[PDB]
Design a protein around this ligand. Structure first.
Ligand SMILES: Nc1ncnc2c1ncn2[C@@H]1O[C@H](COP(=O)(O)OP(=O)(O)O)[C@@H](O)[C@H]1O
Ligand SMILES: O=C(OP(=O)(O)O)[C@H](O)COP(=O)(O)O
Ligand SMILES: [Cl-]
Ligand SMILES: [Mg+2]
Ligand code: NA
Length: 416
């Protein structure tokens, strides 16, 4: 946690320019923000800096996975700037880049109280260290250029704050590479780390983890360590199909599949058996003939398989019944990742049914923790934010805490 680290409440910001990493990677639909949770969560740190006399606050974040190519068409942070203005009651200057001489000039000596938002960090390959070129070939950033990127970010403030809890599992340039003498954790980082420290110290048992979503390559690699902490796991959403293909030889069509993760599925199941972790996988599905809101839909089971060219985008009723049975057994639940494409109504029933069960569980004393940019948007969509124990801004970041890891964005902060 942060007991050993500098935090914003101990940082003198009067007359200082503050460069602040935030997680403004908000969900979007029809080019509009669908949930401003992650933006509102950063307002306490921003307002604290302004109220205590900061010369300026320079905000930097990524949006989506543009893979090191500028894509202002679909991944610009400009809409976040307009949303942040109304949440702050103050104007926000949006810059169309995050590094280079023009950005440096705009941030060098701003008018007192200026709030500046920079363009998407991941438009530059040096933020993640790797990406793709505009033709889609995978590329690696050059070390000299990564150092220059970090040096440019470091010029934009006198002191650094990291409030980007949702990104704190990423050792990316903006998260671990800023070279300023004082590097402090923000109030969202403190709030989230303190909550999880308490909730993970001696979880109530049975402790269920619900793992869904679409970031299969990343998150399947977290299960091994989770199996030492939990008593049950639901594996749903896009995660399930890699398991069902390997274990059941199920036909999955064009459903999400991770070739590298497929190679560890049997090892994970053996470890779950060794550790007494009950694994619940879906047994039926809502299918789609294309990845589209208005796709033709169908039904499938594990026995039937998903037809060629179709994809499973939600679980079916028998799966929901099994998910509900595990939720009913739990005394503590951590849930990251919707169990279907809940943004599209044809494919939202399984996630809504599961949310209903989690809310009922909270009512009878279960500790229920929902985290993630997209999973927290389920809470907003069905108006359950106040009906679960905690809604976190971190998804993958919360799973890495469940694993017992120190997060790089925390580790990179100054020590007291
Ligand atoms: N079966 C599926 N196929 C493809 N995508 C899915 C499936 N089930 C859920 N998803 C997607 O998972 C996405 C969220 O995944 P992720 O970003 O890992 O979750 P979070 O943001 O909560 O951490 C949602 O946008 C949802 O559409
Ligand atoms: O949205 C995030 O993660 P989540 O989708 O796991 O909540 C964080 O902003 C990290 O983004 P990344 O997984 O593209 O590094
Ligand atoms: Cl991924
Ligand atoms: Mg997400
Ligand atoms: Na945030």
């Amino acid at each position: 946690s942060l007991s050993n680290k500098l935090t914003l409440d101990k940082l003198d910001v009067k007359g200082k320019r503050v460069v602040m990493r935030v997680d403004f990677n908000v969900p979007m639909k029809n080019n509009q923000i669908t949930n401003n949770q992650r933006i509102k969560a950063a307002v306490p740190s921003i307002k604290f800096c302004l109220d205590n006399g900061a010369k300026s606050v320079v905000l930097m974040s990524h949006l989506g996975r543009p893979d090191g190519v500028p894509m202002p068409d679909k991944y610009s942070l400009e809409p976040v700037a307009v949303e942040l203005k109304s949440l702050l009651g103050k104007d926000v200057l949006f810059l169309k880049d995050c590094v280079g001489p023009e950005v440096e000039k705009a941030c060098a000596n701003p008018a007192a109280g200026s709030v500046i938002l920079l363009e998407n960090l991941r438009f530059h390959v040096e933020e993640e260290g790797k990406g793709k070129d505009a033709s889609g070939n995978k590329v690696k950033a050059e070390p000299a250029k990564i150092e220059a990127f970090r040096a440019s970010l470091s010029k934009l403030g006198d002191v650094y704050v990291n409030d980007a809890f949702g990104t704190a599992h990423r050792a990316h340039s903006s998260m671990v590479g800023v070279n300023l003498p004082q590097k402090a954790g923000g109030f969202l980082m403190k709030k989230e780390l303190n909550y999880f420290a308490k909730a993970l110290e001696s979880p109530e048992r049975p402790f269920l983890a619900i793992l869904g979503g679409a970031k299969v390559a990343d998150k399947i690699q977290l299960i091994n360590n989770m199996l030492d902490k939990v008593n049950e796991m639901i594996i749903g959403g896009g995660m399930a199909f890699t398991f069902l293909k390997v274990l059941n030889n199920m036909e999955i069509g064009t459903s999400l599949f991770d070739e590298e993760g497929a190679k560890i599925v049997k090892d994970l199941m053996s470890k779950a058996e060794k550790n007494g972790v009950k694994i619940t996988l879906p047994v039926d599905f809502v299918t789609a003939d294309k990845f589209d809101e208005n796709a033709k839909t169908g039904q499938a089971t594990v026995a039937s398989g998903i037809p060629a060219g179709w994809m499973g985008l939600d679980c079916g009723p028998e799966s929901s019944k099994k998910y509900a049975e595990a939720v009913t057994r739990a005394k503590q639940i951590v849930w990251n990742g919707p169990v279907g494409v809940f943004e599209w109504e044809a494919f939202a029933r399984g996630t809504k049914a599961l949310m209903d069960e989690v809310v009922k569980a909270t009512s009878r004393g279960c500790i229920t923790i929902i985290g993630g940019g997209d999973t927290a948007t389920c809470c907003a969509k069905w108006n359950t934010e106040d009906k679960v124990s905690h809604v976190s801004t971190g998804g993958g970041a919360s799973l890495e805490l469940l694993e017992g890891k120190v997060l790089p964005g925390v580790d990179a902060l100054s020590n007291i």
